[PDB]
Design a protein around this ligand. Structure first.
Ligand SMILES: CCNC(=O)Nc1cc(C)on1
Ligand SMILES: CCNC(=O)Nc1cc(C)on1
Lengths: 204, 204
């Protein structure tokens, strides 16, 4: 009776792990497709399953990081959203912190995404008229040539500067979607999705 | 590409259906064991998965009703909780409405649970000093001998009446747990639980 309760709890943890991978895959897919409402509802389902999980494997932690990363990128223009205990950290700064924590390859795409997030973390502050906040995000991020141009743009209050059009929010989203495509191909073979795809195929 | 999106959405619906049955089973188990915190977190996970489901089978609707029923029974003493658009309906009245809607056998246990919920819907109002609310719940529920004693108890403001000890809140919970045991045996063979149990067993 006591050992049965233990086996049940172990079975619940296995199922929660399969649910986390499936929800990450659905979240990645909605982000790639720009299905905003499906992304919001999938994010709510992922947050709840995560609260029901205790011990995490390195793989499950990377899966959660990916979910948290896309959540912050989707809210990158919502400066009112507080993702950290320190209320001064903006959503793109929180996404940058997670991007540098994921156990992943630091290839060319990784650094390009990192640098696009840094430029946009400042740019979103400038477009909202938050010039003093843009300087504060700058000090938190850069602590030379790229750094020098950004400080010049902040001091000139050049909200719609041409530099922000070359390294745009759209460009950041497109590069992030390329990475999301790689995560989609890696997680398409997870237990729940494979089994659900086989039922659908068998009905055709 | 368009047909692939359709097949993916169909696979997501199959997986959401398997997740709903698993979460109902975990919710039933936590309610039976009195694991209050596990019940709260499982209820949050079940509500999110339900919002991601559109077309529902008669079986999936009964599964949701069961989840909603246990949620209202668990909050039966929280008179501040509003489970209906009409703010006057108390949690036990909302549980009674769902109990009479489930496509299930109306056996002796069914009517005993129904009658225990009616007595307790009034009793919880009396114990909180809400005597006028107790009369209003009475009018909503009974619209003779059982009805007559209850009206007499309400008019006498007999909060700790002996009748409420014979047909107690504990007695209602115990009878509801007997029904929950039947739901547990029926849903233990659902896809996610069976597959998760087999992985646990194979590791022993
Ligand atoms: C800081 C509170 N918000 C979040 O952590 N959001 C998340 C996390 C995951 C996962 O998805 N949204
Ligand atoms: C009225 C809003 N609250 C609920 O419907 N609660 C539920 C529903 C399910 C399922 O679990 N809790």
């Amino acid at each position: 009776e006591e050992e049965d309760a233990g086996l049940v709890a172990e079975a619940e943890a296995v199922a929660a792990g399969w649910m986390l991978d499936f929800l990450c895959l659905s979240l990645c897919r909605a982000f790639r497709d720009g299905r905003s409402e499906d992304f919001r509802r999938t994010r709510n389902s992922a947050e709840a399953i995560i609260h029901g999980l205790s011990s995490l494997t390195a793989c499950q932690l990377r899966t959660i990081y990916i979910c948290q990363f896309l959540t912050r990128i989707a809210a990158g223009k919502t400066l009112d959203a507080q993702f950290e205990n320190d209320e001064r950290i903006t959503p793109l700064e929180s996404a940058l912190m997670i991007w540098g924590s994921i156990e992943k390859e630091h290839d060319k795409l990784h650094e390009e995404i990192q640098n696009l997030i840094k430029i946009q973390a400042i740019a979103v502050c400038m477009e909202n008229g938050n010039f003093k906040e843009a300087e504060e995000v700058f000090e938190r991020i850069f602590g030379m040539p790229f750094k020098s141009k950004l400080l010049m743009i902040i001091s000139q209050k050049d909200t719609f500067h041409s530099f922000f059009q070359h390294f745009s929010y759209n460009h950041m989203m497109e590069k992030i979607k390329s990475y999301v495509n790689y995560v989609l191909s890696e997680k398409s073979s997870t237990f729940l999705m494979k089994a659900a795809a086989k039922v659908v195929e068998s009905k055709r």
